[model samples]
Target chain A: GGPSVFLFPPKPKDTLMISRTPEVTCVVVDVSHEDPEVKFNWYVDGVEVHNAKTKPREEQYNNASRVVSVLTVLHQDWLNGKEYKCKVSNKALPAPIEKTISKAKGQPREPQVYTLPPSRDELTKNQVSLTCLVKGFYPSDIAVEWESNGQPENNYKTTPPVLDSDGSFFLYSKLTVDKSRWQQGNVFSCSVMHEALHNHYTQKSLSLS
Target chain B: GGPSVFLFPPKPKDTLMISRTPEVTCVVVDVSHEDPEVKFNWYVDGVEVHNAKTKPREEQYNNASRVVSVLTVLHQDWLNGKEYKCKVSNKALPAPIEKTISKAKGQPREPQVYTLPPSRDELTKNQVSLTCLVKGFYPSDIAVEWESNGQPENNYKTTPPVLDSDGSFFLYSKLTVDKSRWQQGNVFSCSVMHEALHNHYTQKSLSLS
Candidate 1:
């Protein structure tokens, strides 16, 4: 068996996907459980992608079995029940590890936004914690940016987006600041971006009393 | 990039295991993150775990990083003070990704196993949801077998083990048994086994009475 790479743009499962939306998104499978000597070929609906539009690459890892082969493809071609396959062949095994796109979605949704203030303990310790929770979105791709009174702010950690039981997605990011200056009139905000929403995005802002 | 295999022996997370007591565990690493097209070579205390005695494998993934290569060795060989490293190389990048083996443990702990009886509503509806929850253990590697009146039982769904924030593990297995014959004096049980607790196991049983 090959390194069972988790597939994305296919709704968080081990399946190749097809989509009508012609987004320049890549159909990737984690080929991490593979032999270093393995070779890979990318095919869409059984037809291979080549030239300037696609770049097929093989990442090597000898220490741990988390290597990968990637195929850059347009999500549009990945639609209409199009079969996107990452066929890996190696001399070590008689059969090739074939990962055809299987997981996907026809529609998309934007995420719900929420902000949490500092916990009771945080305020007691003269520290404040800012958290932003995003819920029920599609396509694992997501990003978060922070601002303090319209100024770029840093010092935060983000948990990667995860899929819910309904195959929807959610994530949260957090930051810590000084509670002593909590009433400094410093307005803080967390902005989120998703491919489905295009130029439009969602955000939540909070200001001290 | 070919394979983005998730490493950790399903143990996930990167940790340097420390054991005052010894066990037959292997030292592993997630050889992901860093430049692409890298190559790997493994060693134990500076001695290579070449071929046979060690099957050095490279798992693959080509998207979003996070893949790994793995080295298999006797816990005896990887025991205390063993300096293990996965040496990576690539023509595209000047420097190699050298991921040394760190983080592990020796002593194993018994997991707490509990069975949840389906609600009375489920019983009244002629449906039985038999569940076994295994909680709080290291290594994450575990197996479960179901039995009824000491006989083997099947037809259930098992969600893979999930990592807790503290790096410990939890998993649950479920079986949809017939509520009719379930009360026919067939006591149900779930047995769990782990490498840490060799020759010993934890079992949870529920009787019809």
Candidate 2:
């Protein structure tokens, strides 16, 4: 028998890294509970970096006390397209986690809102239509809601967000109201919830005469 | 061994998925040069989806004819977080390539710029100091340059981009011009390059008298 001690592995943090034009960032595996018992190392294309560049390697913690190591590499090095990974081991887990750096990054942009008026034919009758045009946001998953006189209204139609030329997104939502309500200059609003906004929400209002 | 033919695995495409308050997406894997011998399948948390919801799935290509699959899960189906994957298997591939959705989405944002003048003392001396303030960008990778009369100069200083409480970034670049250049009214410009701008670049110019 050996030293009769059991060794374990550490759980890795976000393994896939997304960097910008000229640099790659690698987050070291995260370890909790028994901190001093864990160890970390780095690798690129199956070879260890060995900290040759001294490129910012360290550990920090969150309010939850989980610790993680961090590293950075030149974007050129990252694009060389060889696999980059973080190796983690500890006395509390069974196997090491080989976390690789993902190759792609999805850009995010804020949505711009425009309240457009409806067709003349639709307005001449009993109802007036308004369109909420939300443009240039990311992730393609957006929540849209319409309100009249500060109250949420159920009658609205939304199209699935469309992918735009620059990889951002655009979407359209339609709300119909009684023409008399709009003719009287009632306040109508469209609220958008997306990750890129300040509170993940933004709004635009319309009033048609 | 029936003719002993070799099996090869299909290449997987981008698996970085981004969801809103609720949703999931599946990207169709691409295959070419060999076909009609393979079948496609989907999975969630180790169980086959069985195409029950029959989510919107489509395919498209360009001149080079690179085919990709696209699927959007109705907001109802993506909640079980165990695992989501695209499975690709063929006689060429000894086994299936289980490409899991990557959790990291490199959300990039365009930077907003504001040009500010130096204090009265710095402006009156033999040198004029000006700062270009950039804010609310993501990915922390940016390229900045200062041009004097349309020629890039190396005398400018830029601070490393800083992370904000809301995960956006802010950075500053300072350029000092010789008083003669300022008095002579040479155009001093700061150019910022990030993925979030038109043509991925924008500039702010300064001229002090």
Candidate 3:
């Protein structure tokens, strides 16, 4: 009754590109003496996370109970280079046990940016719209801006990033401009900034046909 | 220069409650020598798994490279309550480095089953439908059957299990019957079988209003 065992230990759940918050779960399957003093704790980047959720569920046929803990972290924090750890302790253990998941360090995927000129339908409007498409990027956070003839354009709408099946994200921004400006062959540029681009902006430009 | 470090190391991905196959990944971020012989291996329940996928991707800003290994296992195998291990070896290490994830042993969540009578919209048809709702279960795999007065009814349609955010699964089965039979107040039962019930079937009964 002094030694306990794990039915399922601790592990990080598969992360999705679209998740704003990711989670890690830990479970203690068996407590030899059915002790209620079992404790579960979490830590990130060497600092203890005090808000993790822990609960105990009853075992239908046995007196032994199970404990589960889940830790949810903001995607921004998870992306930072550090380790997330789950620690479990109970009266039966000689000491607390620990497991960790560390963010991988590698080259992030750079986004491919391109601009699409006004379509035939858009040409019929008094104010035409130019579209900028950003595709195949990692670490979803990104910034997009539009410029017309070296001047910033504020009349634009951007969609929230959409996740692709292949673990990349795509987003598009539409800039509304005067038809007169478009007929004059004015140059328009869409600038994209992301961590994968190494603090540099990837710009795509388009002009009248 | 003989030491190697894990940028991300090895960890299990968050498993979707509905996934037919789950995966685990390992990454070696810093290999001082970029040795071609760097090896990644996987083991489940102490037996080696030989078909894991391994790939090396270049780091855009540095001469050093990164390696990733992904091991996919059938969800059935993953639920069998065993530990999965990832081992990494290189000329720089005194011995192979390893990590593991063990399936927790605990009471599985039992499904709650209930029968819904034919809706008003279904009354216009010569044939009416009875729905069996099975809610809140773990480990997805389940069997559902329809019985009329203790006799098995094969004419029914069951939806694929849907995953809930709470890490449980729900499913429904529709049994179509002639209006005349439904009007006779015949007893009908829906039986749900799941691992959580330890091979016992949870049954719900219904009859004419």
Best by lDDT: 3
lDDT of 3 by residue, B1-209 (tens): 34344423122222323333466667776665556466887898989988788866645335555677888765556666777788888776789888776554555688866566664444676876676766568766677889987899876766666665456666667676888899899989998877566434577787885
Q: How many backbone clashes does every candidate have?
A: 68, 12, 10
Residue-wise C-alpha lDDT for candidate 1, range B1-209, written one tens digit per residue: 22222223322211222222222223223433454444556676777665423234445353323324545545434433366666655444446545555435645555656565553434664546566656556666567778887788865555566654445665656666888767675678988876445444667786664
Tell me each candidate's i-RMS in Å.
11.8, 20.0, 20.3
The TM-scores of all predictions, comma-separated, are 0.40, 0.29, 0.30
- DockQ score, prediction 2: 0.02
Residue B86 in candidate 1, Cα distance off native in Å: 26
Q: Write the per-residue lDDT of candidate 3 for residues A1-209, one digit (tens) a residue.
A: 44343322122222323333466667676666546667877888889988777765646345666667778766556656567777888777889877776554554678877566654444565876676767668766677889976889977766566664456666667676899998898999998877567444678887886
Model 1 chain A weakest lDDT span, ten residues long:
A12-21
lDDT of 3: 0.67
Candidate 1 local lDDT, A1-209, one digit each (tens): 33443333432211222322232223333444434454657677777765213244444454333334445555444433466666666554557667656335546767766565543333555556566656557766667777876777765655566655456766656555677656576778888776555454666886563
Give the best candidate by DockQ.
Answer: 1
For all candidates in order, the CA lDDT equals 0.55, 0.55, 0.67
Docking class of 2: incorrect
lDDT of 2: 0.55
Return the candidate ranking by TM-score, descending.
Answer: 1, 3, 2
Q: Give me the runs in candidate 1 sitting further than 4 Å from their true place.
A: A1-39, A52-69, A75-83, A149-152, A162-167, A198-200, B1-209
Model 2 C-alpha lDDT per residue in residues A91-116, reported as the tens digit of each score: 55567655676333466577877665
